[PDB]
Every structure is written in C-alpha cells, then in structure tokens.
C-alpha cells in the first residue's frame, strides 16, 4: 500500500514536470521567434 | 523489493528533472528580462 501511494504521488510529480516543460518550450520558442523577427 | 528499489531510483530521477527545470526557468526568465530591458 505504501508503494501504490508512492506511485500515485510520483505520477502527480511527473504531471507537474510536464506542465513546467511545456511552459518553457513555449517561452523559448517565443524568444527564438522574437529574435528571428528582429 | 525490486519495485521499492525502482521507486527509490525513480525519485532520484524526478529530483534531477526538477533541478533541471528550475535551472531553465531561471535562464529563460533572465533572457526575457534582458530583451525587455534592451
């Protein structure tokens, strides 16, 4: 039961790291485009 | 016991991916600010 609880909490951590990677991919793409456009 | 060992090692991987996401969030924010300031 401790291992099931650990995997459930680890899944929540993975969802948070996916949210953060998608935020950073959109922000670096924005900056790339801004520099290309300049 | 193999599954406990797997979850322990996966937790170490997740900590490494959190370190890397926080490094990249600070570096893209720095670049955003630099461009705003220019």
């Amino acid at each position: 039961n401790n291992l099931l609880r650990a995997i459930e909490a680890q899944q929540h951590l993975l969802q948070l790291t996916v949210w953060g990677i998608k935020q950073l991919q959109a922000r670096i793409l924005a900056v790339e485009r801004y520099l290309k456009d300049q | 016991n193999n599954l406990l060992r797997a979850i322990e090692a996966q937790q170490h991987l997740l900590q490494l991916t959190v370190w890397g996401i926080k490094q990249l969030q600070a570096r893209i924010l720095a670049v955003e600010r630099y461009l705003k300031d220019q």
Binding site: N2, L3, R5, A6, A9, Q10, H12, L13, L16, W19, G20 | L4, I7, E8, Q11, L14, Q15, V18, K22, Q25
Partner: peptide, 25 residues
Amino acid sequence: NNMTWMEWDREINNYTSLIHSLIEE
C-alpha cells in the same frame, strides 16, 4: 492553469516529502 512557479515549487516539495516517508516506512 492558474498554476504559478511559486505554487509549482510548493506542490513539488509537498509530494517529494510524502514519497520520502512512504519509501522509509
């Protein structure tokens, strides 16, 4: 969503502390 980086940090820390206890126990 409403998510901010300060909230993201708090939630990472909360889930990491929990997993540590579950794994030790």
